[PDB]
Design an enzyme around this catalytic site. Structure first.
Site, PDB file in Angstrom:
ATOM      1  N   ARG A 103       3.913  -7.991  29.992  1.00  0.00           N
ATOM      2  CA  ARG A 103       4.498  -7.838  28.912  1.00  0.00           C
ATOM      3  C   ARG A 103       4.694  -6.205  28.577  1.00  0.00           C
ATOM      4  O   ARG A 103       3.238  -5.629  28.383  1.00  0.00           O
ATOM      5  CB  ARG A 103       3.810  -8.424  27.724  1.00  0.00           C
ATOM      6  CG  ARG A 103       4.200  -8.271  26.425  1.00  0.00           C
ATOM      7  CD  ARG A 103       3.689  -9.329  25.053  1.00  0.00           C
ATOM      8  NE  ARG A 103       4.612  -9.165  24.026  1.00  0.00           N
ATOM      9  CZ  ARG A 103       4.249  -8.706  22.624  1.00  0.00           C
ATOM     10  NH1 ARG A 103       3.092  -8.162  22.578  1.00  0.00           N
ATOM     11  NH2 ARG A 103       5.032  -8.646  21.563  1.00  0.00           N
ATOM     12  N   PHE A 111       5.184   1.248  22.468  1.00  0.00           N
ATOM     13  CA  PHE A 111       4.264   0.447  22.379  1.00  0.00           C
ATOM     14  C   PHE A 111       2.985   0.375  23.317  1.00  0.00           C
ATOM     15  O   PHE A 111       2.106   0.993  23.240  1.00  0.00           O
ATOM     16  CB  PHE A 111       4.687  -0.774  21.655  1.00  0.00           C
ATOM     17  CG  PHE A 111       3.600  -1.803  21.097  1.00  0.00           C
ATOM     18  CD1 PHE A 111       2.332  -1.168  20.799  1.00  0.00           C
ATOM     19  CD2 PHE A 111       4.046  -3.120  20.850  1.00  0.00           C
ATOM     20  CE1 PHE A 111       1.443  -2.189  20.262  1.00  0.00           C
ATOM     21  CE2 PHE A 111       3.300  -4.095  20.469  1.00  0.00           C
ATOM     22  CZ  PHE A 111       1.630  -3.467  20.121  1.00  0.00           C
ATOM     23  N   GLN A 125       1.078  -4.471  28.626  1.00  0.00           N
ATOM     24  CA  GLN A 125      -0.221  -5.439  28.859  1.00  0.00           C
ATOM     25  C   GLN A 125      -0.342  -6.276  30.268  1.00  0.00           C
ATOM     26  O   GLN A 125       0.811  -6.519  30.601  1.00  0.00           O
ATOM     27  CB  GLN A 125       0.002  -6.399  27.647  1.00  0.00           C
ATOM     28  CG  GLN A 125      -1.302  -7.499  27.606  1.00  0.00           C
ATOM     29  CD  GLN A 125      -1.255  -8.198  26.245  1.00  0.00           C
ATOM     30  OE1 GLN A 125      -1.097  -7.711  25.437  1.00  0.00           O
ATOM     31  NE2 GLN A 125      -1.799  -9.343  26.364  1.00  0.00           N
ATOM     32  N   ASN A 154      -6.542  -9.587  22.580  1.00  0.00           N
ATOM     33  CA  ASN A 154      -7.420 -10.956  22.031  1.00  0.00           C
ATOM     34  C   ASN A 154      -6.728 -11.765  21.265  1.00  0.00           C
ATOM     35  O   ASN A 154      -5.485 -11.661  21.129  1.00  0.00           O
ATOM     36  CB  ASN A 154      -8.558 -10.321  21.443  1.00  0.00           C
ATOM     37  CG  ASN A 154      -8.520  -9.699  19.975  1.00  0.00           C
ATOM     38  OD1 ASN A 154      -7.714 -10.267  19.265  1.00  0.00           O
ATOM     39  ND2 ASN A 154      -8.859  -8.501  19.875  1.00  0.00           N
ATOM     40  N   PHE A 172      -4.607  -3.794  27.352  1.00  0.00           N
ATOM     41  CA  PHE A 172      -3.389  -3.102  27.278  1.00  0.00           C
ATOM     42  C   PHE A 172      -3.545  -1.680  27.278  1.00  0.00           C
ATOM     43  O   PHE A 172      -4.618  -1.383  26.933  1.00  0.00           O
ATOM     44  CB  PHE A 172      -2.706  -3.473  25.915  1.00  0.00           C
ATOM     45  CG  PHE A 172      -3.261  -3.308  24.760  1.00  0.00           C
ATOM     46  CD1 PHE A 172      -4.181  -4.151  24.261  1.00  0.00           C
ATOM     47  CD2 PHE A 172      -2.977  -1.999  23.921  1.00  0.00           C
ATOM     48  CE1 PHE A 172      -4.800  -4.037  23.101  1.00  0.00           C
ATOM     49  CE2 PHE A 172      -3.605  -2.078  22.808  1.00  0.00           C
ATOM     50  CZ  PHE A 172      -4.726  -2.948  22.387  1.00  0.00           C
ATOM     51  N   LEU A 185      -4.387  -1.373  15.103  1.00  0.00           N
ATOM     52  CA  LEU A 185      -5.317  -2.147  15.840  1.00  0.00           C
ATOM     53  C   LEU A 185      -6.500  -1.660  15.666  1.00  0.00           C
ATOM     54  O   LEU A 185      -7.789  -2.437  16.186  1.00  0.00           O
ATOM     55  CB  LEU A 185      -4.793  -2.225  17.264  1.00  0.00           C
ATOM     56  CG  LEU A 185      -3.519  -2.658  17.682  1.00  0.00           C
ATOM     57  CD1 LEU A 185      -3.082  -2.484  18.818  1.00  0.00           C
ATOM     58  CD2 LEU A 185      -3.426  -4.078  17.110  1.00  0.00           C
ATOM     59  N   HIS A 190      -9.056  -4.437  17.943  1.00  0.00           N
ATOM     60  CA  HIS A 190      -9.097  -4.510  19.372  1.00  0.00           C
ATOM     61  C   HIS A 190     -10.112  -3.668  19.731  1.00  0.00           C
ATOM     62  O   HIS A 190     -10.284  -2.407  19.177  1.00  0.00           O
ATOM     63  CB  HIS A 190      -7.600  -4.278  20.092  1.00  0.00           C
ATOM     64  CG  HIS A 190      -6.668  -5.383  19.690  1.00  0.00           C
ATOM     65  ND1 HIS A 190      -6.600  -6.485  20.448  1.00  0.00           N
ATOM     66  CD2 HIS A 190      -6.024  -5.585  18.425  1.00  0.00           C
ATOM     67  CE1 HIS A 190      -5.663  -7.067  19.940  1.00  0.00           C
ATOM     68  NE2 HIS A 190      -5.403  -6.848  18.715  1.00  0.00           N
TER      69      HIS A 190
HETATM   70  N1  LIG Z   1      -2.630 -14.677  23.161  1.00  0.00           N
HETATM   71  C1  LIG Z   1      -3.449 -15.339  23.957  1.00  0.00           C
HETATM   72  O1  LIG Z   1      -3.134 -16.459  23.923  1.00  0.00           O
HETATM   73  C2  LIG Z   1      -4.485 -14.580  24.520  1.00  0.00           C
HETATM   74  C3  LIG Z   1      -4.674 -13.455  24.253  1.00  0.00           C
HETATM   75  C4  LIG Z   1      -5.696 -12.804  24.831  1.00  0.00           C
HETATM   76  C5  LIG Z   1      -6.855 -13.530  25.617  1.00  0.00           C
HETATM   77  N2  LIG Z   1      -7.751 -12.938  26.329  1.00  0.00           N
HETATM   78  C6  LIG Z   1      -6.493 -14.891  25.726  1.00  0.00           C
HETATM   79  N3  LIG Z   1      -7.492 -15.610  26.140  1.00  0.00           N
HETATM   80  C7  LIG Z   1      -5.481 -15.649  25.047  1.00  0.00           C
END
Ligand SMILES: NC(=O)c1ccc(N)c(N)c1
EC number: 5.2.1.8
Length: 165
Positions: free
Chosen positions: A55, A60, A63, A102, A113, A122, A126
């Site tokens: 992504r 921005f 990720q 997360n 990211f 954030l 984060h």
């Molecule tokens: N958006 C999500 O489903 C997701 C994002 C970050 C993570 N570390 C995990 N485990 C899942």
């Protein structure tokens, strides 16, 4: 003593692009820095080599780090599936900040990211744990393959990674 440094060798549809290196703030967030370091060397038997930046949103972030589902729904830490928010001492001050992705409080895994803008909203949500050291130009080149919705126009991969020094 000295904060560790790690590198990612980036490719675009398999073609080498360049190297990005990162300082990891082990002095302020040792548990979070150690997870990213170990995932970058692969020394636990799993990690970032061969994974993609799934992504990328210009203006921005970029990720990555989902080496189990390849799309933002997976990944795991060196401590188990998830681990806690270690602290929020460091803030999202501008381009090149490295921070944990997360899915709610205390849900850090392996996804992360790289900021390409200041992302202050954030802060306190984060965990920031490092910054780009060399290769921001390579991050900017990656960023050009992103889109508004995050889907990339070419496949952006970590062809190799490890620790410097
Ligand atoms: N958006 C999500 O489903 C997701 C994002 C970050 C993570 N570390 C995990 N485990 C899942």
């Amino acid at each position: 003593m000295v904060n560790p440094t790690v590198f990612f060798d980036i490719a675009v549809d398999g073609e080498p692009l360049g190297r990005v290196s990162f300082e990891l703030f082990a002095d302020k967030v040792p548990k979070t820095a150690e997870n990213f370091r170990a995932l970058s060397t692969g020394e636990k038997g799993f990690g970032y080599k061969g994974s993609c930046f799934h992504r990328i949103i210009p203006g921005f972030m970029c990720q990555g780090g989902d080496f189990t589902r390849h799309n933002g729904t997976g990944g795991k830490s060196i401590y188990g599936e998830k681990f806690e928010d270690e602290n929020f001492i460091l803030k999202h001050t501008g381009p090149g900040i490295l921070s944990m992705a997360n899915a709610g409080p205390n849900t850090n895994g392996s996804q992360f990211f790289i900021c390409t803008a200041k992302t202050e909203w954030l802060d306190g949500k984060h965990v920031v744990f490092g910054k780009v050291k060399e290769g921001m130009n390579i991050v900017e080149a990656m960023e050009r393959f992103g889109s508004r919705n995050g889907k990339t126009s070419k496949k952006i991969t970590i062809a190799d990674c490890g620790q410097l020094e």
